[PDB]
Amino acid sequence: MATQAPTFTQPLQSVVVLEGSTATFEAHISGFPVPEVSWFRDGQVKLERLPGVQISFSDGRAKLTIPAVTKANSGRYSLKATNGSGQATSTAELLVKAETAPPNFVQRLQSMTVRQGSQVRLQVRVTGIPTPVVKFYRDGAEIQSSLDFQISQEGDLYSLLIAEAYPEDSGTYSVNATNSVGRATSTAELLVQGE
Resolution of the determined structure in angstroms stands at 2.8
Question: Is 1-94's fold the same as 95-195's?
Answer: yes
d(CA 7, CA 109): 54
d(CA 133, CA 15): 27
Alpha helices (runs of H) in 14-108, residue ranges in sequence order: none
User: Is CATH 2.60.40.10 the classification given to domain 95-195?
Assistant: yes
Tell which CATH architecture fits domain 1-94: Sandwich (2.60)
What one-character DSSP code corresponds to residue 85?
T
Most distant pair of Cα atoms in the chain: their distance: 85
Tell me the torsion sign for CA atoms 19, 133, 110, 161. Answer: positive
d(CA 12, CA 94): 10
What are the structural domain ranges in the chain?
1-94, 95-195
Task: Give all strands of the β-sheet with 112-115 in edge-to-edge order.
Answer: 112-115, 182-193, 171-179, 133-138, 141-142
Cβ count within 10 A of residue 31 = 23
DSSP string, 163-188: SS--GGG-EEEEEEEEETTEEEEEEE
Cβ count within 10 A of residue 145 = 13
Q: Which amino acid is at 129?
A: I
